[PDB]
Amino acid sequence: GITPRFSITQDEEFIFLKIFISNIRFSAVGLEIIIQENMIIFHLSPYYLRLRFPHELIDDERSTAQYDSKDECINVKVAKLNKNEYFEDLDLPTKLLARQGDLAGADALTENTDAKKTQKPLIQEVETDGVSNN
């Protein structure tokens, strides 16, 4: 992850990620933030950032980011899969980067699983070869 400063906020409807940046070369052709199956990928700006939350988000039409000049900061919006839901990793920066470090130091992680689950199995079928003659 590359960036001077960035803070994430959680809401009872969606997630609000804020990024701090200077008034340096800010192109408008490379700007395009995309959200993965669950985690969020920050491609905007010349600096790439990777956010990994303990939950799963979704990228819909509502999802979008707006550039703030008054503060020279960037605002990223992303809808969640469950309303009234929060996070327990946004509090820590490393928890988002998910770095490895120097494999030296007492560190631990505790992520909770989701309650709402979906069960939609399926059994495929296809003919087969075989004769009856000797």
What report would you give on this structure?
The protein has 134 residues and is mainly β. The chain has one domain: Immunoglobulin-like (Sandwich), CATH 2.60.40.790. The protein has 1 helix and 8 strands, in the order ββββββββα. Strands 1, 2, 6, 7 and 8 form a 5-stranded antiparallel β-sheet that branches. A 3-stranded antiparallel β-sheet has the order 3-4-5, with no helix packed on it. Strand 4 and strand 5 form a beta hairpin. The longest helix is centred in the C-terminal third of the chain and has 4 residues. It starts with a strand and ends in a 37-residue tail after the last helix. It is classed as structural protein.
